[PDB]
Amino acid sequence: FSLVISGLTTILKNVNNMRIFGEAAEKNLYLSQLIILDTLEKCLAGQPKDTMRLDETMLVKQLLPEICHFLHTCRQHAAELRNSASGVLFSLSCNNFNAVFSRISTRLQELTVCDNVDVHDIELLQYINVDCAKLKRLLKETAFKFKALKKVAQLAVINSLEKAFWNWVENYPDEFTKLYQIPQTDMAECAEKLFDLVDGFAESTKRKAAVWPLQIILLILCPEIIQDISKDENNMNKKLFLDSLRKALAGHSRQLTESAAIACVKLCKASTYINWEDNSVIFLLVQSMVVDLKNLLFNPSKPFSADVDLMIDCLVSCFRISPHNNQHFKICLAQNSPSTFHYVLVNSLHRIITNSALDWWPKIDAVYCHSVELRNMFGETLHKAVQTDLETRSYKYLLLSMVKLIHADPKLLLCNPRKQGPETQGSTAELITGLVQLVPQSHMPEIAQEAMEALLVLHQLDSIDLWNPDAPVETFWEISSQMLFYICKKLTSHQMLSSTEILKWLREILICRNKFLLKNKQADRSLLFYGVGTPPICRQAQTKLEVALYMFLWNPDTEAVLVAMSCFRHLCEEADIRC
Numbered sequence: 001f002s003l004v005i006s007g008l009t010t011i012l013k014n015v016n017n018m019r020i021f022g023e024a025a026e027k028n029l030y031l032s033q034l035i036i037l038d039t040l041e042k043c044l045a046g047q048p049k050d051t052m053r054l055d056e057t058m059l060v061k062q063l064l065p066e067i068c069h070f071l072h073t074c075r076q077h078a079a080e081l082r083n084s085a086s087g088v089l090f091s092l093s094c095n096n097f098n099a100v101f102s103r104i105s106t107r108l109q110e111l112t113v114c115d116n117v118d119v120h121d122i123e124l125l126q127y128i129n130v131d132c133a134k135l136k137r138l139l140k141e142t143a144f145k146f147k148a149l150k151k152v153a154q155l156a157v158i159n160s161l162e163k164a165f166w167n168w169v170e171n172y173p174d175e176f177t178k179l180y181q182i183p184q185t186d187m188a189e190c191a192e193k194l195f196d197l198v199d200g201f202a203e204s205t206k207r208k209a210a211v212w213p214l215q216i217i218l219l220i221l222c223p224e225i226i227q228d229i230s231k232d233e234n235n236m237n238k239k240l241f242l243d244s245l246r247k248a249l250a251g252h253s254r255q256l257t258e259s260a261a262i263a264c265v266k267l268c269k270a271s272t273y274i275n276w277e278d279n280s281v282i283f284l285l286v287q288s289m290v291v292d293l294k295n296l297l298f299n300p301s302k303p304f305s306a307d308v309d310l311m312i313d314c315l316v317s318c319f320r321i322s323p324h325n326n327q328h329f330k331i332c333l334a335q336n337s338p339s340t341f342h343y344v345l346v347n348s349l350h351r352i353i354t355n356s357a358l359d360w361w362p363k364i365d366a367v368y369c370h371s372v373e374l375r376n377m378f379g380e381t382l383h384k385a386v387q388t389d390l391e392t393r394s395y396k397y398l399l400l401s402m403v404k405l406i407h408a409d410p411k412l413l414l415c416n417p418r419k420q421g422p423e424t425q426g427s428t429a430e431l432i433t434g435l436v437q438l439v440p441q442s443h444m445p446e447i448a449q450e451a452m453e454a455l456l457v458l459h460q461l462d463s464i465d466l467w468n469p470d471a472p473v474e475t476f477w478e479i480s481s482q483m484l485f486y487i488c489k490k491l492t493s494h495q496m497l498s499s500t501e502i503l504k505w506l507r508e509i510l511i512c513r514n515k516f517l518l519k520n521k522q523a524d525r526s527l528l529f530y531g532v533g534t535p536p537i538c539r540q541a542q543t544k545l546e547v548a549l550y551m552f553l554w555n556p557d558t559e560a561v562l563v564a565m566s567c568f569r570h571l572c573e574e575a576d577i578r579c
Contacts, residue, residue: 037084093129130168139190209259488544
């Protein structure tokens with residue numbers, strides 16, 4: 001506990017207090033500090049809250065210049081260090097929240113009386129873990145210090161508060177619904193005071209646009225007030241603010257419309273976070289501007305505003321609230337739709353499959369109705385990089401996105417019932433063949449690695465069974481033989497600049513093939529008639545396998561010999577299993 005924290009803090013301070021005059025020294029320190037921060041964050045997460053590390057106030061004060069040794073001034077390794085420090089501070093807030101809040105309050109009080117920048121050490125609430133009572137207390141402090149503060153300080157507090165509320169929603173997606181279930185008078189009063197303070201800063205279009213993202217959130221924080229606005233003099237400012245948005249959202253300037261669209265997307269995200277069963281007219285309020293948002297973002301002729309993130313967020317929110325209303329997705333599944341539309345749709349589907357709370361949020365289902373078209377688009381892509389510059393870069397990124405999608409879920413594209421005869425060459429087999437051809441491609445290595453790991457992911461027996469409902473074993477063996485042919489010809493061609501990784505993944509593929517063969521043999525002894533007795537394709541595939549393996553022992557590298565010997569052991573294992 002305390003001793004480990006002290007040692008880690010001393011090590012981190014020594015690392016931060018360095019020189020790194022040379023070139024490789026900075027790169028080495030970038031990894032060293034990242035590893036140290038990861039270890040510290042893991043240690044803090046493991047340490048129970050019952051430790052009560054209030055005695056670590058000195059350690060927290062040291063970490064203020066140590067954990068924020070690079071985020072104090074806040075001027076790629078910097079991004080990784082920032083992420084590590086954010087995680088560390090989030091872990092700290094679980095136990096030493098009081099010291100962090102005291103430091104934040106002291107910094108705010110000092111900066112109010114105090115000109116380049118002073119939000120540093122005062123915007124620490126940005127990465128601080130939030131709680132309902134903690135959020136209410138911070139709102140009270142903001143109410144008590146907003147007026148007698150600089151405009152820059154007020155804007156910094158607003159920016160910290162918006163994503164602090166986002167953090168509270170994400171970490172605690174139960175108190176947010178609790179507020180709309182059981183009202184809290186203190187939170188409502190704090191939200192009203194914050195709204196009044198924000199309405200104090202409504203200088204011009206820029207200031208109003210900046211306030212709108214917070215103003216919408218604060219309005220959401222008051223359910224009863226929002227309900228009453230539709231039907232008082234005290235509510236005149238909120239009705240005026242909403243009206244403004246509607247029009248700025250009605251396209252009648254550009255900056256105001258963009259800010260209003262961002263605020264309405266945040267509204268949609270909050271409504272998704274809001275109770276689906278208990279709409280409380282929040283869903284209706286969102287739907288009042290969902291049509292305008294659809295006409296803004298999802299109009300092909302109308303250019304977007306940045307665009308990808310907002311489009312994905314809006315699509316995810318629309319799917320969450322209305323899974324059946326898949327008209328926008330259907331519009332994105334159009335040839336005339338831009339490649340950006342396809343990229344946004346792919347990202348939306350991935351994040352549906354990726355991390356998401358198991359709330360009223362719909363699952364990956366109800367998206368298989370468009371699986372045929374989904375594979376139609378990536379077939380239309382046909383890997384134009386191997387089959388002006390901006391289009392090629394967009395296509396390559398879109399290829400990487402679909403590969404990551406397949407990583408997340410194979411079942412999205414595996415719905416291929418047409419694979420009966422010659423149509424199999426335009427089916428699951430075509431998908432696997434196209435995925436394989438990416439590996440030898442030297443134009444882009446990251447896509448090769450991603451598609452390679454995707455082939456590994458689809459090669460497990462669970463993904464194997466989702467290929468041919470009639471005779472999965474025969475089609476599996478045939479396609480595996482085809483890809484083994486291609487890989488062996490590529491390897492014997494001796495143009496594999498990354499031959500080490502290729503050999504490793506080939507070992508994995510062989511291991512999975514032998515595991516599936518053992519599973520089939522235990523299921524059915526007799527495969528036997530498809531490569532064990534043109535000659536059988538499996539025999540030729542094994543011949544290519546052993547030829548390439550014999551080539552590997554001759555490779556002038558060093559780690560490849562071990563790979564080839566492990567592959568020899570696995571070939572012996574599969575030969576034993578087949579008998």
